[PDB]
Amino acid sequence: TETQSLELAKELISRPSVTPDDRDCQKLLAERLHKIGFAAEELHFGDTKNIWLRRGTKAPVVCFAGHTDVVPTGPVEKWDSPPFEPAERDGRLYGRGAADMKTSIACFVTACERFVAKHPNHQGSIALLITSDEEGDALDGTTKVVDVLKARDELIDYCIVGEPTAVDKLGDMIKNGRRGSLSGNLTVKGKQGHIAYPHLAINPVHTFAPALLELTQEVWDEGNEYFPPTSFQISNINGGTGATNVIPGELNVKFNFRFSTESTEAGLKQRVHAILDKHGVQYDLQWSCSGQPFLTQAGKLTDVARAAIAETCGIEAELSTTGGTSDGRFIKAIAQELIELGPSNATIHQINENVRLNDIPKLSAVYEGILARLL
């Protein structure tokens, strides 16, 4: 079985492409796939590099999407082997980006090579949408490329985002969508004063308390067959001057919803304002929504991914929308069906990040099985 995915994953990992830097990872990919008919189109915005590689000119268009940037390593001596010197050890490949998400990219590229070699007259088109900023604020990465593609009507039928999705074994989980994310920055207003004269002050911690309990106990929805219940979480709360004999004048609270399609952005905001208003809270509230939920319901793409996983890995993949998010939240606008599929995400963003070596050629063969079933 092929070793080409492994060695390409190594050369990618060896590049310290901390966001938003690419270190010519995109150039490497472009030059390699150019050899088998992929045209390259660079789309740079701000400090972020993006590439849209494409072979073929007609439908169906199957897209692989991913990112070449990695999160910072932390103090390097805490690693067992250096984070940008990929090492084989105990049946694993260790390095920053080994799981998120350079190995996926390497597996897909080799899958393209093997597919195109076995089927040089295949129908449709194969594309790669690669960015150097998914891990940061992501203002100039995939979202810009999607807008360019949508503006010139270059649409996608099937997209696979190579993010790591597995719980333990490769293939046990595919993502067919993600929660939206809605964030609030609440400033509860009181009136500062000496703690010994509470009747001349208004303690914003005390005024907020009944709403906070109602917020943290609230059932937002029950989820459905594809999504878990909408989740509300407080991330920060800060109030006071540091003196233990003063009642603060204001209290700042930061909170977030990861919400399913059972609830809407507008609905959540109205509910939050209603809870605060019914308890007489005086406040300012700034909202920000960094994404809507998206979903690809059971269909050809999910069926095909399951079948390829059953063939290669021997297991039944489960569909999931849990966890964080991905660039799928931008791409779904131009992709009719989109899934995410990759290796274990157990060690992402952590020190001694790794992937099982046996999963590497399996992942690539899954991607190749997907290509064959769609094209």
Report how far residue 300's alpha carbon sits from residue 197's, in angstroms, rounded to the nearest whole number: 68
Structure tokens at 179: 């929660």
Identify what 236 binds: Zn ion, its own copies, none; CB under 5 to 8 Å per kind: its own copies
> Binding-site residue total for its own copies (CB under 8 A)?
40
Identify what 37 binds: Zn ion, its own copies, none; CB under 5 to 8 Å per kind: none
State which amino acid sits at residue 159.
C
134 is catalytic: yes
Q: Which of 21, 22, 133, 134 is catalytic?
A: 134
Identify what 280 binds: Zn ion, its own copies, none; CB under 5 to 8 Å per kind: none
Report how far residue 192's alpha carbon sits from residue 195's, in angstroms, rounded to the nearest whole number: 9
Looking at beta carbons only, is 255 or 367 nearer to its own copies? 255
Phi, psi at residue 50, to the nearest 5°?
-135, 145
Q: Which of residues 94-123 bind Zn ion (CB under 5 A)?
A: 100-101
- The stretch near its own copies (CB under 8 A) out of 48-56, 66-74, 318-326, 356-364 is 318-326
What distances in angstroms separate CA 216 from CA 167, 185, 232, one per listed residue?
28, 16, 7
Where on the phi/psi map is residue 279: left (φ > 0), alpha (ψ -120 to 50), or beta? alpha
Residue 202: CB atoms within 10 A of its CB come to 19
Smallest gap from residue 346 Cβ to its own copies (A) = 12
Structure tokens at 192: 């500062």
Cβ neighbours of residue 247 under 8 Å, at least 6 residues apart? Answer: 190, 191, 192, 193, 194, 195, 198, 201, 202, 203
State yes or no: residue 240 binds its own copies (CB under 8 A): yes
67 is in an annotated binding site: yes
- The stretch near its own copies (CB under 8 A) out of 58-66, 151-159, 194-202, 218-226 is 194-202
Looking at beta carbons only, is 100 or 337 nearer to Zn ion? 100
Report how far residue 149's alpha carbon sits from residue 128's, in angstroms, rounded to the nearest whole number: 13
CA dihedral 295→326→143→24, nearest 10 degrees, is -140
Looking at beta carbons only, is 133 or 337 nearer to Zn ion? 133
Q: Which of 69, 113, 327, 340 is catalytic?
A: 69
Bridge partners (DSSP) listed for residue 63: 127, 159
Q: Nearest residue by C-beta to Zn ion?
A: 100
State yes or no: residue 245 binds its own copies (CB under 8 A): yes
State yes or no: residue 329 binds its own copies (CB under 8 A): no
- The stretch near its own copies (CB under 8 A) out of 130-138, 240-248, 264-272, 331-339 is 240-248
Identify what 100 binds: its own copies, Zn ion, none; CB under 5 to 8 Å per kind: Zn ion
Bridge partners (DSSP) listed for residue 183: 256, 288
337 is catalytic: no
Pick from 342, 338, 327: which is nearest to 304 by CA? 338
Structure tokens at 37: 């008919």
What distances in angstroms separate CA 247 from CA 108, 199, 208, 239, 240, one per listed residue?
59, 11, 14, 9, 7
Looking at beta carbons only, is 120 or 242 nearer to its own copies? 242
* 268 close to 250: Cβ distance less than 8 angstroms: no
State yes or no: residue 258 binds its own copies (CB under 8 A): yes
Smallest gap from residue 105 Cβ to its own copies (A) = 23
State yes or no: residue 179 binds its own copies (CB under 8 A): yes
163 is in an annotated binding site: yes
Q: Which residues belong to the active site?
A: 69, 134
**Residues in contact with its own copies by the rule CB under 8 A:** 179, 183, 194-198, 203, 205-206, 209-210, 212-213, 216-217, 231, 233-248, 251, 254, 256, 258, 323-325
Residues flagged as binding site for Zn(2+): 67, 100, 135, 163, 349
**Residues in contact with Zn ion by the rule CB under 5 A:** 100-101, 163
